[PDB]
With several copies, the nearest count.
Chain A
Amino acid sequence: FTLIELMIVIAIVGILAAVALPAYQDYTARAQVSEAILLAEGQKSAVTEYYLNHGKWPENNTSAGVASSPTDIKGKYVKEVEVKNGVVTATMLSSGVNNEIKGKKLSLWARRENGSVKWFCGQPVTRTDDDTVADAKDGKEIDTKHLPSTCRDNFDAK
């Protein structure tokens, strides 16, 4: 006979949350990845200096002169950050993150410019030789959709 204004408006806010759910869920993940990136960076300094001073990429965190323990460079969504031959990889925690990005990671690696180096940011990579890396293809890479426009670099970016 009457009461449908309360019933529909409680059910439009319910469906509004369902539509606002995936937007906040990738905005959210995309936010948790933007930090793995900040934790990865700022460690470029150590790595850059080590390379320019010696001409060899730092083998591990201790070589680069950073928390000798990968797990000591963690965060809220970051379970750690390891330096492996100049390549700095950031791992996403398992608690406090999206759902399709946890335990997932990215990498920052550089290239000899000769007198200086240039840095790249993208999906996990392994270093082959002092001037070549390759996709650490394995299945734990953070999905392209969660990576900034500034971190879409490919293993062979120059």
Chain B
Amino acid sequence: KMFADFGSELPGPTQMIVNFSHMAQEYFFHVAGSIVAVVMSFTWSYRQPLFMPVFGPVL
């Protein structure tokens, strides 16, 4: 959100004069890449606190 707030006309943005709803929906890409980033670091924090025989859980 910090690199994407360094002004206007970045990679993938819009100009600020669009209507807000369209601007927010196009960025949906980046809102999504942030949520996925969150889900991942949550997964690592939640978890974390053919040779058929090779596939069995051993001791």
Q: How many residues of A contact B (CB 8 A)?
A: 14
With A14-B16, A15-B16: A7-B1 Cβ-Cβ less than 8 Å: no
Max chain B C-beta neighbours (<10 A), residue from A7, A8, A11, A14: A7
| Chain B proximity of A101: nearest CB distance (Å) | 24
Q: How many residues of B contact A (CB 8 A)?
A: 14
Identify the closest chain A residue to B3 (Cβ). Answer: A7
| Chain B proximity of A96: nearest CB distance (Å) | 18
Could you give, for residues 1-45 of chain B, a 1 whenever the CB lies within 8 Å of some chain A CB and a 0 otherwise? 101011100100000111111011000000000000000000000
* Count of A-B residue pairs with CB < 8 Å: 44
| Chain B proximity of A1: nearest CB distance (Å) | 5
Contact B7 A10 (CB under 8 A): yes
Could you give, for residues 1-40 of chain A, a 1 whenever the CB lies within 8 Å of some chain B CB and a 0 otherwise? 1111011101110110011000000000000000000000
Please report which residues of chain A, range 41-87, place their CB below 8 angstroms from some CB of chain B when the two chains form the complex. Answer: none
| Chain B proximity of A158: nearest CB distance (Å) | 41
With A1-B1, A14-B7: A7-B24 Cβ-Cβ less than 8 Å: no
A2, A18, A19: the one contacting B20 at CB < 8 Å is A2
Chain B residues closer than 8 Å to A2, beta-carbon distance = 20, 23-24
With A1-B1, A14-B7: A7-B21 Cβ-Cβ less than 8 Å: yes
Contact A8 B17 (CB under 8 A): no
Give me the interface of B with A, judged by CB distance under 8 Å: 1, 3, 5-7, 10, 16-21, 23-24
What are the 4 tightest A-B residue pairs by CB atom distance, in nearest-first order? A3-B20, A15-B17, A11-B16, A7-B19
Q: Given known contacts A4-B5, A7-B3, what 4 new A-B pairs fall within 8 Å (CB)? A: A3-B18, A6-B17, A10-B19, A14-B7
